[PDB]
Design a protein around this ligand. Structure first.
Ligand code: BGC
Ligand code: CA
Ligand code: NA
Length: 307
């Protein structure tokens, strides 16, 4: 006996979604009647759309979709609803209007703003404890920021709220550079290397990255330029970032809870595949069809909890 569930990951080479992918597959092992059909959309929404057509033709009873493009949620909804197939969107949040457009569309993710606020609180905490970080002694944080994908809710909120949080805590900032590296380590290394080769190089006091993968690239570029005392902040708490916090090569990150997002996505998909209320028999709190899993700030104080 078997219930098929189709799953997409927007790109398997995304560091964070690779963690989520493995956690989904691990959780599915405990429900041997489920057969997961797991797909790498390779960062291409048209490929994902074709994959969804195949999954529906192969008789999946639910879809768990990590969109390539958040704006494509209506296309996916239109495909799934033809035969009343439920969708748990996850990690890339569709619009409220898209979620409300189909009774069987749900979302599992995070409060994106919370991660920006926590990151700003972490930067404030360390800035206030490290007066030497104010290289030009002007009382302002001269920073560069590595942004995630334009329009991605986590990139937009982390970028807006890290700065609002710092400023509201009484720490003025000066944005020397702000550009996207598309969540990617190599793009971030190249972008940081360019900034370190230009006129703002010696003015940079803090590196803020919307994720750990981009922070890791910035760390490499800082090392190449012998700027290892410029602090770097990320988001996700990837193992590699936790190792950099331990060595002092990153100042802080924020746990993006892949384990519980994967478990909630799988649990909701499994209930919906059976025609049951989405959170039945689970602890997940659905609020207007959305589950949000808390972020947690991580630095040297609480690092031992995570390694
Ligand atoms: O959608 C993918 C993105 O999701 C974000 O929540 C993670 O912080 C990023 O690392 C990841 O690249
Ligand atoms: Ca300064
Ligand atoms: Na994992």
């Amino acid at each position: 006996a078997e219930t098929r569930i189709g799953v997409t990951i927007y790109k398997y080479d995304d560091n964070f979604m690779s963690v989520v992918r493995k956690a989904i597959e691990k959780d599915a092992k405990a429900s041997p009647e489920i057969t997961l059909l797991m797909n790498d959309s390779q960062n291409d929404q048209s490929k994902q759309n074709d994959q969804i057509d195949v999954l529906l033709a192969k008789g999946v009873k639910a879809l768990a979709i990590n969109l390539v493009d958040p704006a494509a949620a209506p296309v996916v909804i239109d495909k799934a609803r033809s035969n009343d197939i439920p969708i748990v969107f996850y990690n890339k949040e569709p619009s409220r209007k898209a979620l409300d457009s189909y009774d069987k569309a749900y979302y599992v993710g995070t409060d994106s703003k919370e991660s920006g606020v926590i990151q700003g609180e972490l930067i404030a905490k360390h800035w206030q404890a490290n007066p030497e970080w104010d290289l030009n002694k002007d009382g302002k944080i001269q920073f560069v920021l590595l942004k995630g994908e334009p329009g991605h809710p986590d990139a937009e909120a982390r970028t807006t709220y890290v700065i609002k949080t710092l400023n509201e805590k009484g720490l003025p900032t000066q944005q020397l550079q702000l550009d996207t590296a598309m969540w990617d380590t190599a793009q971030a290394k190249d972008k940081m290397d360019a900034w370190l080769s230009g006129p703002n190089a010696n003015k940079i006091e803090v590196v803020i990255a919307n994720n750990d993968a981009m922070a890791m690239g910035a760390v490499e570029a800082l090392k190449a330029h012998n700027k290892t005392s410029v602090p770097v902040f990320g988001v996700d708490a990837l193992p590699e970032a936790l190792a950099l916090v331990k060595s002092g090569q990153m100042a802080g990150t924020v746990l993006n809870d892949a384990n519980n997002q994967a478990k909630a996505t799988f649990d909701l998909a499994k209930n919906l595949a059976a025609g049951k209320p989405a959170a039945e028999g689970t602890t997940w709190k659905i609020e207007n069809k959305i589950v949000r899993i808390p972020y947690v700030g991580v630095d040297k104080d609480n690092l031992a909890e995570f390694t």
